Amino acid sequence: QVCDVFDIYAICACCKVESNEVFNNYTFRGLGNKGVLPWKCISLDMKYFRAVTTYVNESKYEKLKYKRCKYLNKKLQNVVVMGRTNWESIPKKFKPLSNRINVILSRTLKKEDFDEDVYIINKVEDLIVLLGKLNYYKCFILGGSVVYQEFLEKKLIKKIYFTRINSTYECDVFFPEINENEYQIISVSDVYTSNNTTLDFIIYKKTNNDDEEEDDFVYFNFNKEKEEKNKNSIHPNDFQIYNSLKYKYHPEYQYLNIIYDIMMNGNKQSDRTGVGVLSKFGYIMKFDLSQYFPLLTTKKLFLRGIIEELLWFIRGETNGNTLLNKNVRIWEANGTREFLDNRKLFHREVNDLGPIYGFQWRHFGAEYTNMYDNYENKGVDQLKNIINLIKNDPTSRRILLCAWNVKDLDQMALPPCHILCQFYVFDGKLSCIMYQRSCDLGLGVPFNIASYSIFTHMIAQVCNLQPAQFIHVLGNAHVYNNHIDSLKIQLNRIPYPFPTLKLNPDIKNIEDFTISDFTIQNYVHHEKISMD
Amino acid sequence: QVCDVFDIYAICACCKVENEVFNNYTFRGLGNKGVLPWKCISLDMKYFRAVTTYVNESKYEKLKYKRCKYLQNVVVMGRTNWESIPKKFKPLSNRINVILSRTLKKEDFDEDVYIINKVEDLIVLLGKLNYYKCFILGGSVVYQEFLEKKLIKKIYFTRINSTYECDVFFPEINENEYQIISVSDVYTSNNTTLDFIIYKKTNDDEEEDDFVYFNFNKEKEEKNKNSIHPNDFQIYNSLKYKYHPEYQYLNIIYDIMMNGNKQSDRTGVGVLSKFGYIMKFDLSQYFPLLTTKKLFLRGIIEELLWFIRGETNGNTLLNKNVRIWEANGTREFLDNRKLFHREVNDLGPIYGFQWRHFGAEYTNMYDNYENKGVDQLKNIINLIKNDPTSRRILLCAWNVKDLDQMALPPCHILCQFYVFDGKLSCIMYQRSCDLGLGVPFNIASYSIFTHMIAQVCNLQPAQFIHVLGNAHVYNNHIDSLKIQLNRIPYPFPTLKLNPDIKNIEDFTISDFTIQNYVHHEKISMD
Ligand SMILES: NC(=O)C1=CN([C@@H]2O[C@H](COP(=O)(O)OP(=O)(O)OC[C@H]3O[C@@H](n4cnc5c(N)ncnc54)[C@@H](OP(=O)(O)O)[C@@H]3O)[C@@H](O)[C@H]2O)C=CC1
Ligand SMILES: NC(=O)C1=CN([C@@H]2O[C@H](COP(=O)(O)OP(=O)(O)OC[C@H]3O[C@@H](n4cnc5c(N)ncnc54)[C@H](OP(=O)(O)O)[C@@H]3O)[C@@H](O)[C@H]2O)C=CC1
Ligand SMILES: CC1(C)N=C(N)N=C(N)N1OCC(=O)Nc1ccc(Cl)cc1
Ligand SMILES: CC1(C)N=C(N)N=C(N)N1OCC(=O)Nc1ccc(Cl)cc1
Structure with missing residues (x-):
């Protein structure tokens, strides 16, 4: 017209x-x-x-x-x-x-x-x-x-x-x-x-409700997986909205596009329980924390729980009871009689999760006894050490924090999903690589992105730096088969602009943070989804 | 015409x-x-x-x-x-x-x-x-x-x-x-x-404007970010399609020369640094031994065999004229490490010790450690063979307790292994990467390693995935890497392992052949 x-x-x-x-x-x-x-x-x-x-x-x-x-x-x-x-x-x-x-x-x-x-x-x-x-x-x-x-x-x-x-x-x-x-x-x-x-x-x-070196491309694709034998042929009609978009430059598409690659190209494996996943191996996401806080918008997420978990880590706690008294159930199932018994931890108290994140972050190498013990000046205080390296030797290439204590794996309720954080410092700006060995794209990863982004903010602040990039490396990246329907709904939602995180700026010490020092401003989000 | x-x-x-x-x-x-x-x-x-x-x-x-x-x-x-x-x-x-x-x-x-x-x-x-x-x-x-x-x-x-x-x-x-x-x-x-x-x-595009608008913020009006010129990456920038896997390495060199952060290091030499890269090489289709310069693999194969044996004795290598750990075992180096009570070429509880005896008290490099600490190498092999869908198949060299006892902390943090349809893939996470001298050897090392684990588990090698943390080019390597970027890779060689070898501890230097290594001439990175 x-x-x-x-x-x-x-x-x-x-x-x-x-x-x-x-x-x-x-x-x-x-x-x-x-x-x-x-x-x-x-x-x-x-x-x-x-x-x-x-x-x-x-x-x-x-x-x-x-x-x-x-x-x-x-x-x-x-x-x-x-x-x-x-x-x-x-x-x-x-x-x-x-x-x-x-x-x-x-x-x-x-x-x-x-x-x-x-x-x-x-x-x-x-x-x-x-x-x-x-x-x-x-x-x-x-x-x-x-x-x-x-x-x-x-x-x-x-x-x-x-x-x-x-x-x-x-x-x-x-x-x-x-x-x-x-x-x-x-x-x-x-x-x-x-x-x-x-x-x-x-x-x-x-709605209405030099072209010589373009042929050279068609050639260098003579050996491509056709439309039919593209592993799991899920139906086009399902991802109508997601595939309609011409430019998908919102950083949330970094997560969304991995869900897609796993759904379309994922390997079918029956897993630790006898359930069913699609898996691939080796992804990277980068999130510019100076520009936005990457809390996903294509569904609702609450951060109270995962901030409590992060404060519980920094304190060196291994006591599930502390989180349950705050009505945070993130670790409840890994702490039961049934579970500790099935991990052969017969001589371990309920909700005693053994030498996990917190214990490895403040006490790596100390003999774990029980979750009530005073482990002061026992084991390597990794968190204090990396806060010192970032402050005094910022170009150091050894600012790793590691949870994967090989010696203690069998004594933990389960080995760490989140293996290590390496830190990097240029021009008063802090970046953070986190290597994840096992990533549930469906429930885990949205939270995992939120946790380490908040952590980068905290370290950056108490070291008088500005958060730059949070880089997320996924090892075994998997989608549970019963999450597939829920994830289809989600891939057809269009992201909103990310919110912003405010840290109470009076906090100069990594240990001095408390819940009320954390404000998420302008979270605009789609509707809650049960992946189940 | x-x-x-x-x-x-x-x-x-x-x-x-x-x-x-x-x-x-x-x-x-x-x-x-x-x-x-x-x-x-x-x-x-x-x-x-x-x-x-x-x-x-x-x-x-x-x-x-x-x-x-x-x-x-x-x-x-x-x-x-x-x-x-x-x-x-x-x-x-x-x-x-x-x-x-x-x-x-x-x-x-x-x-x-x-x-x-x-x-x-x-x-x-x-x-x-x-x-x-x-x-x-x-x-x-x-x-x-x-x-x-x-x-x-x-x-x-x-x-x-x-x-x-x-x-x-x-x-x-x-x-x-x-x-x-x-x-x-x-x-x-x-x-x-x-x-x-x-x-x-030799001598709808509604959506093409939408592309330009989306680029309205970029820090590229042509201002020479680093002092690295246009006409020097001529051959490199004069290629349309660069789909040879070696470009994964070469393009990281380019990104770090063009966009890298100027930094002091311990040595004081000066580096350009960036943070967080992936490389994937298909081990089922080639052996990724860089072709844009001569690389030798005897030393790095001896290094690997030394690891598998559990050795921390720098001298076992020096007597085989593999000088990879010579500098890291001198009196002068161990003293700067505060290791005053450590014998020359006793590298402390490094890779080999950690792979075979993680958690054991390190004494000296001649002690017997049989059945002490966690034999991780044994453990990831059994897991591969008996529980291949496990997401817990990691070989970790970074032992926080022992870091200060090591001549130096491991550059290579960990290997994670993945198994599907009788095929084995491996991720190595490297905390610190010398792109000029180190990384080419590191790619070859863990690719060979990926093959060795594959063979002794009756699997085909699939992907070796190399995650770089601190990725740095030495200022004093930039001339050499300029010469290198404007070379065009040859097709890669292949690795043949002696097929009789069926346990990880039975490989000798003879059991390794590189075939059809077509390469450009040697470069002194200095
Ligand atoms: N690898 C590759 O890319 C390809 C190479 N090959 C291989 O190449 C080999 C053949 O090499 P070669 O011996 O050179 O054979 P050619 O393919 O060059 O065939 C030569 C023939 O072409 C004709 N001919 C030659 N010159 C002229 C001319 N100036 N004008 C008109 N007709 C001419 C014939 O003349 P006359 O009538 O007098 O015999 C002559 O015998 C085979 O081994 C084949 O397998 C195969 C296909 C492509
Ligand atoms: N956030 C944003 O993207 C933008 C913000 N704004 C904001 O919007 C406000 C102004 O908008 P609003 O008050 O709606 O008014 P407008 O800016 O739309 O002005 C309307 C006036 O324009 C004239 N006009 C409009 N249509 C016709 C027509 N068909 N024929 C003849 N004259 C016509 C009339 O002027 P007259 O009275 O002379 O007859 C009418 O009163 C401001 O606060 C401005 O800052 C505006 C633009 C962009
Ligand atoms: C097959 C070959 C060697 N590869 C390329 N890239 N291009 C060619 N020129 N080739 O030769 C093909 C040809 O001309 N001859 C030929 C030989 C056998 C059969 Cl079956 C068909 C054609
Ligand atoms: C600038 C603004 C608000 N942003 C977008 N995306 N599109 C608009 N329409 N905008 O308003 C521009 C305009 O019409 N008014 C305007 C006001 C002040 C100045 Cl200095 C210039 C134009």
């Missing part, structure tokens, strides 16, 4: 508005307040805004001239169209919008009332005529709310370039509720931090 | 022919007693089908509008090439068959199978035909003539990394004339390694 010929796109930025909370895309709808934007500066958004609304491709115009000239029977700049309130919100120093053909919709104002190089129009109709008579690359509709509403209603927008600002502000004007039959998300950017907020960038698309 | 207008490509496979310098000319064996030198290499024969038959009609109009202004492919043989084909397929599964000959007239074959008089009489035949591209199938004389008359554009060169008896040879491709632009993955077919290379003759 008219939207494809004239390439009329919309670009906006929406925050959450003043309102056990449910989240949909309508969560991000706040456009402005008291004639201006709800927020002071979000520079990264503003820079995106300029890059998109001023970018042209010289060479591509020729074919757009042809297309548009054909329909009418007949430096390069983009057009930008804005309501009069929007235009008035711009500071003088930036009027008219640089390196762009500015247009303004208005009834109360005519050319005579503007000093500046701008086209005025009183009709949506008048714009289409204007574009007909103009050389431009792309036409972007800048808002505000009234301009957005009518260009949508009139089926005129090809794509909505949409910034999710993952914070809340007082708002008096809102973006229109986008009909999900009309527009579908096809792209989601990396998540980022700017002016103390996370944000990403998503592109909604409308 | 003719060869770009008409699209004349050669397509050859060359094996090796009966110390030794290597270069591309190494590969030239074309045929023997009128047939191919080798019995059957079905992957190359499959590659041959695909490349010659493939057609893309949506790029033929662009060809049609250039060709005139001057659907199948044209395939050009020579009698003895046309002849040597077994009967039951002629013509070749739907291609425009064509034969250069002198004493063969176009009468006594069909009405599709166009014969030609001379080389100059083919340009005639093409201008009057409807074909995608033109493939010279060889053999010796055909290639010679078609190359001599600068008719060939690209060359689809299959490198057969095994030696055979040959009576005919591809010509020495002039490397100021032609040059390699693509190299494929390395493969095993019919008990040889091979790869596929390409010589070129």
